[PDB]
Design a protein around this ligand. Structure first.
Ligand SMILES: [Ca+2]
Length: 262
């Protein structure tokens, strides 16, 4: 059996739930941590099912973990360690945000508290980021191809060619995004990704550049499903991902389905 499967068999209602099956505790990380600006670690409390993978969450330009705080309890309650981080300076570029995403992951593995390290599987790490943090999410996978999953949220980046990414990448675009429009950012990012890569592009209807900053069930249900399928190798969640989701909130979806288990 898959030793990384956590939680009961998933329903369409379960992935959408505000509170997952797990109970969430937290740990505050000082900004004097090396490589990044600290953050808040959300981790499951139940330990009788085994350790969990982790996901580091980066904010956008001039932003902090407050704009990404709702991902913590929402995602960690489904069986993940969520590390919403702050950057060194709020004006950090996408390239710098990719390094600090990895520096946060290193902290989880090397210097985190015993209560977090004892619950952590350091071989199953993922990244996620909003806007310039989304560009940093793409940057991190280029810097560390061993990551399990990557979720750029309405990402922004100068470079458009990502044809050497080897990490399963889920790009969420906003239809009415005029800061990082999907026509010149999110879609060119997805298309430049290797055709052989397990990837997906979800465009939210009527959403703006700042939609990932507020509780959104369409984002949460498939962020959870993407993390389950590639961080936990939980094929029980391939149902919600392949074939392409048909939610009313979604305006366009592209994928390399099916995601054959490797
Ligand atoms: Ca620091």
């Amino acid at each position: 059996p898959n030793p990384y499967e956590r939680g009961p068999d998933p329903t369409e209602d379960s992935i959408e739930a505000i509170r997952g099956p797990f109970s969430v505790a937290t740990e505050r990380v000082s900004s004097f941590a090396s490589g990044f600006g600290g953050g808040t670690i959300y981790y499951p409390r139940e330990t009788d099912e085994g350790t969990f993978g982790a996901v580091a969450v980066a904010p956008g330009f001039t932003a902090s973990q407050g704009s990404m705080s709702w991902y913590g309890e929402r995602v960690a309650s489904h069986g993940f360690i969520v590390f919403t981080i702050d950057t060194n300076t709020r004006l950090d570029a996408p390239g710098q945000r990719g390094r600090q995403l990895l520096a946060a992951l290193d902290y989880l593995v090397e210097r985190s508290d015993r209560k977090v390290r004892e619950r952590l599987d350091p071989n199953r790490l993922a990244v996620m980021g909003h806007a310039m943090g989304g560009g940093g999410s793409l940057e991190a996978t280029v810097m560390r191809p061993s990551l399990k999953a990557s979720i750029p949220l309405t990402p922004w980046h100068l470079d458009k060619t990502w044809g050497q990414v080897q990490v399963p990448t889920f790009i969420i675009g906003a239809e009415l995004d005029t800061i990082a429009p999907v026509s010149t950012h999110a879609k060119p990012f997805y298309e430049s990704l290797p055709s052989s890569l397990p990837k997906a592009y979800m465009e939210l209807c009527g959403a703006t550049h700042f939609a990932p900053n507020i509780p959104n069930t369409t984002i949460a249900k498939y962020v959870i499903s993407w993390l389950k399928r590639f961080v936990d190798e939980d094929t029980r969640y391939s149902q919600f991902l392949c074939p392409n989701p048909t939610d009313r909130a979604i305006c366009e979806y592209r994928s390399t389905c099916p995601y054959k288990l490797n």
